[PDB]
């Protein structure tokens, strides 16, 4: 019973999915920079300072994920749009798992 109407909803989710991939890349870039600093020759104090210096970026990544969740939350998917509903659930869970990694980063910088 696949309908053309559900395609319109699946496309919305695919764009959101792409947006999430982009934020995830930034989180990875952010993670490499984090390890790079941890591996760096900076003196423990300027190091702690470069780390907390990464605070702005992690908060910006967290905020972008939150805006995505808010956008996913505007969708209303009928019970019969099973594929759309499953896609929505999968995306929210992926975003939430990325949020948890961001929180782990916030726990390693500016002390904890």
């Amino acid at each position: 019973g696949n309908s053309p109407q559900e395609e319109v909803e699946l496309k919305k989710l695919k764009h959101l999915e792409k947006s999430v991939e982009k934020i995830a890349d930034q989180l990875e870039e952010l993670n490499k920079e984090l390890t790079g600093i941890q591996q760096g020759f900076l003196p423990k104090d300027l190091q702690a300072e470069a780390l907390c210096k990464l605070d702005r970026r992690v908060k910006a990544t967290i905020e972008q994920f939150m805006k995505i969740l808010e956008e996913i939350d505007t969708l209303i998917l009928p019970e019969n749009f099973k594929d759309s509903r499953l896609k929505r659930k999968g995306l929210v869970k992926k975003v939430q798992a990325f949020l948890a990694e961001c929180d782990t980063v916030e726990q390693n910088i500016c002390q904890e």
Binding site: R56, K59, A60, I62, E63, M66, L69, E70, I72, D73, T74, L75, I76, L77, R88, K89, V92, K93, Q96, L99
Partner: protein, 377 residues
Amino acid sequence: PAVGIDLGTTYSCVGVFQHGKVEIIANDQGNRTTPSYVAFTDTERLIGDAAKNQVAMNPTNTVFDAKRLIGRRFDDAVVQSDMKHWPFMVVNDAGRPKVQVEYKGETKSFYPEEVSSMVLTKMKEIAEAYLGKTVTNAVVTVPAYFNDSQRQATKDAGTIAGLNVLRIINEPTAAAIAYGLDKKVGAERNVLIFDLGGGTFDVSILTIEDGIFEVKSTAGDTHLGGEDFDNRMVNHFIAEFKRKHKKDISENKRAVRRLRTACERAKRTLSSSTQASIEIDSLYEGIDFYTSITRARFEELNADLFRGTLDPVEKALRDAKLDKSQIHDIVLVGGSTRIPKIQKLLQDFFNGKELNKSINPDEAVAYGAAVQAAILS
């Protein structure tokens, strides 16, 4: 070309009268109103939408509500009282307040009119992007109850923003002008402006004689608006989640935020429909929250609040020594006036008088300001 600027506590609007018509200018993000926000970061200064978008990331250095401090003394009761609710620091500089923030790695402070001039610069640039031409003349509006210092402080912000402030007019007067209540038939018209928008509630009664305006009285609540109504809906859904799942989501800030954003949207939906649905996957502890709310319930949750708006109305008719029957026109400005239960409590207080509201309530004031700007240009 001269423009009209509505400098709001939380949002501003700019319009222009061109080709015999008024155009509310959309900003770079396509919004016809711009947040009165200024943010200071380690690298740049953001204004408008860009400033509001990063508030969650930099709360202590993102300023808004400058209109509440402008032209006031530090020891002013409003200042002392309001600052308890701001994330940013307000300091005293010789009896004059300044907001203190971290900007570009340094501690900087700004006077209220500087912050507002920054917002005015944005509205100026917004009109120029739309017009593709320079802008230097403008009419800026203020609340009917603003005093000399406040009026001058606003004029000054315009000046700092490099604007030639043709005149500072009262917001309710601008709304009346937008509807053209100053060009109607007969004589001495009594007009009441019901302004519920941007976080403030103001009622004003005006008399128009041969196009001349006189403010007879002003009443309202300086800290009342949509966010209070949304919060009641949020309270509603938090309780409902507790009933259904026996879990309290109130200490998880992200769950509360997703809920609040969903409620703000549902509220807008309930202004043109009788029920709104919300689907939020994995809201808290993996639990999906699919639910709905009727217009009826929304109104019951805000019963005291909606009803309370009439307190200021009667007080305004009181000090205007007028009777509700003597009011000739009623004008609605402010987004919250889109709420039907608000329109009823009002229209029936004035036993059936039709209300003026064909003009977007968020833009009426700027609209009226644009009209005046052209005539004064």
